[PDB]
């Protein structure tokens, strides 16, 4: 029986702090100037944030306010005290962003699979559901002693490609110093985080009766975030996408405006793949787009259905570029990408989100595909 493990992290993980700050700067600029060009990278370490990169924008007032946007995001994450390892109101904030006033050979992958309602691979889907729920129970006061930093890991056993057993769940979370790990943290996390997520999913074949749950296996986790650590933007690209289950062409998402094809074309390929499986044309699919210098539209569109197609895969390949307009400008227009919608994507995955509606997750092309067959 094959095992597969994926992980997720909360918004309080230092690498995710950086992704969120980078995309908070992006959203701030897009809110005032939708055509801003942005390439913003964030570093955090003990007591400090360093935001660098380049921007072309007319949004000078938003640019001036970046320092405050940074602090506010850190406070929203929940870092508001040195006791927690980090305080957005009093940490160091340094800005080294160059500012001015105003194709390529490419491959990009997308993936979808009918193993979850959100059409994601089960290990990453479950890991993200758990990291989101972990944060939710902190913020809604159900478990008020929790602190922001955390990580989830999910190992599933498969038999002939069917997920049959939930093998291991690891949940590591930051928490107040007075909390008993064995008699308070562990059962609260089992009841309020693991069991609620498993009930939400109600998976048809995943046996969770003998799951090994480990909560804070390395013990006390009182201080977290950048304290005694460091984070950078774009260091969780597998967490951001498919958890290792699918191939990745390279390129991080956060801090990049939608003109960056690494972001927008990856989003488009997810959209294509999700609509293909939701249309029942395959149970799982990897979609690959090929772009060439000097041509807007793709020079190639390839799929792999792993034996699960219900129609000829060559037919699927033919109809995708008829149904979808995969020119970069069309993707931007059609998904309405020149809007401040990115800070929300910077933790808990860019794909398969059950808590927010994202343009590239909409099943608005299922009918189109069915008509084209």
- Which residues are part of the catalytic machinery? 13, 15-16, 41, 54, 151, 221, 229-230, 235-236, 256, 260, 262
Terminal Cα distance for the chain, rounded? 36
Cβ–Cβ under 8 Å, residues 49 and 21: yes
Cβ atoms within 10 Å of 228's Cβ, excluding its own: 11
Spatial separation of the C-alpha atoms in residues 324 and 307, rounded to whole Å:
24
158 is in an annotated binding site: no
- Pick the binder of a copy of itself from 39, 125, 185, 266 (CB under 8 A): 39
Cβ atoms within 10 Å of 5's Cβ, excluding its own: 16
52 vs 278, beta carbon nearer a copy of itself: 52
Residue 248 near which of a copy of itself, Ca ion, none (CB within 5-8 Å, type-dependent): a copy of itself
318 is in an annotated binding site: no
How are strands ordered across the β-sheet holding 162-175? Answer: 2-9, 146-159, 162-175, 212-215
Cβ 236 to a copy of itself, closest distance in Å?
7
Residues 251-270 that bind a copy of itself (CB under 8 A): 251-252
Spatial separation of the C-alpha atoms in residues 352 and 358, rounded to whole Å:
9
Alpha-carbon distance values, 253 to 40, 214, 266, 329 (Å): 11, 31, 9, 18
For residue 330, report the phi and psi dihedrals to the nearest 5 degrees: -70, -40
Cβ 17 to a copy of itself, closest distance in Å?
13
227 vs 341, beta carbon nearer a copy of itself: 227
For residue 240, report the phi and psi dihedrals to the nearest 5 degrees: -70, -20
* Tokens read off for 155: 């190992």
Spatial separation of the C-alpha atoms in residues 52 and 65, rounded to whole Å:
15
Residue 368 near which of a copy of itself, Ca ion, none (CB within 5-8 Å, type-dependent): Ca ion
188 is in an annotated binding site: no
3-class SS at 358? coil
Cβ 19 to a copy of itself, closest distance in Å?
12
Cβ 221 to a copy of itself, closest distance in Å?
15
220 is in an annotated binding site: yes
Residues 215-254 that bind a copy of itself (CB under 8 A): 217, 228-230, 232-239, 243-252
Binding of residue 45 to a copy of itself (CB under 8 A):
yes
65 is in an annotated binding site: no
Nearest to 247 by CA among 278, 285, 292: 285
DSSP structure string for 99-145: EE-----EEEEEEEETTSTTSS-HHHHHHHHHHHHHHHHHHTSSSTT
DSSP structure string for 20-89: HHHHHHHHHHHHH-TT-EEEEEEEEETTEEEEEEEEE-S-HHHHHTHHHHHHHHHHHHT-EEGGGTEETT
Nearest to 17 by CA among 63, 56, 48: 48
Binding of residue 139 to a copy of itself (CB under 8 A):
no
Residues 349-368 that bind Ca ion (CB under 5 A): 364, 367-368
- Pick the binder of a copy of itself from 67, 105, 205, 364 (CB under 8 A): 105
Mask of contacts with Ca ion, 122-151, x by CB under 5 A? ------------------------------
Residues 178-237 that bind Ca ion (CB under 5 A): 204
235 is in an annotated binding site: yes
Which positions make up the binding site for ATP?
A: 13, 149-151, 220-221, 229, 235-236, 252, 256
Query: Where does this chain bind a copy of itself (CB under 8 A)?
Result: 2-7, 39, 41, 43, 45-46, 48, 50, 52-54, 96, 98, 104-107, 109, 153, 155, 168, 170, 214, 217, 228-230, 232-239, 243-252, 288, 290, 292-293, 299-300, 302, 313-314, 317
Which positions make up the binding site for Mg(2+)?
A: 15
Which positions make up the binding site for K(+)?
A: 41
Query: Where does this chain bind Ca ion (CB under 5 A)?
Result: 204, 364, 367-368, 371
Which positions make up the binding site?
A: 13, 15, 41, 54, 100, 149-151, 220-221, 229, 235-236, 252, 256, 260
């Amino acid at each position: 029986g094959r095992l597969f493990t994926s992980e997720s992290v909360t918004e309080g993980h230092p690498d995710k702090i950086c992704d969120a700050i980078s995309d908070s700067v992006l959203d701030a600029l897009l809110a005032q100037d939708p055509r801003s060009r942005v390439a913003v990278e964030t570093l955090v370490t003990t007591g400090q944030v360093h935001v660098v990169g380049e921007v072309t924008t007319t949004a000078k007032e938003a640019f001036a306010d970046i320092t405050n946007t940074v602090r506010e995001r850190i406070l929203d994450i929940g870092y508001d005290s040195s006791d927690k390892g980090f305080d957005g109101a009093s940490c160091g904030v340094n800005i080294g962003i160059g500012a001015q006033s105003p194709g390529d050979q490419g491959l990009m992958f997308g993936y979808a699979i009918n193993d979850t309602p959100e059409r994601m691979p089960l290990p990453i889907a479950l890991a993200h559901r758990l990291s989101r729920r972990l944060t939710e129970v902190r913020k809604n006061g159900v478990l008020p002693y929790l602190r922001p930093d955390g990580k989830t890991q999910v190992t599933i056993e498969f038999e002939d490609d069917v997920p049959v057993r939930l093998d291991t769940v690891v949940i590591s979370t930051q928490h107040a110093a007075d909390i008993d790990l064995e008699n308070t943290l562990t059962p609260d996390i089992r009841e309020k985080v693991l069991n609620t997520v498993l009930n939400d999913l109600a998976h048809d074949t995943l046996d969770t009766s003998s799951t090994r749950l480990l909560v804070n296996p390395t013990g006390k986790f009182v201080v977290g975030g950048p304290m005694g650590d460091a984070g950078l933007t774009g260091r969780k690209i597998i967490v951001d996408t498919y958890g290792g289950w699918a191939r990745h062409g390279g390129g991080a998402f956060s801090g990049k405006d939608p003109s960056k094809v690494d972001r927008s074309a990856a989003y488009a390929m997810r959209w294509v793949a999700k609509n293909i499986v939701a249309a029942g044309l395959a149970e799982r699919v990897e979609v690959q787009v090929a772009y060439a210098i000097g041509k807007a539209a793709p020079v190639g569109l390839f799929i792999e259905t792993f034996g699960t197609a219900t129609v000829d895969p060559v037919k699927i390949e033919k109809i995708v570029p008829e149904v979808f307009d995969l020119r970069p400008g069309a993707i931007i227009r059609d998904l309405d990408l020149l809007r401040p919608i990115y800070a929300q994507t910077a933790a808990y995955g860019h794909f398969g989100r059950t808590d927010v509606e994202l343009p590239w997750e909409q099943l608005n092309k299922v009918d189109d595909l069915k008509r084209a067959i």
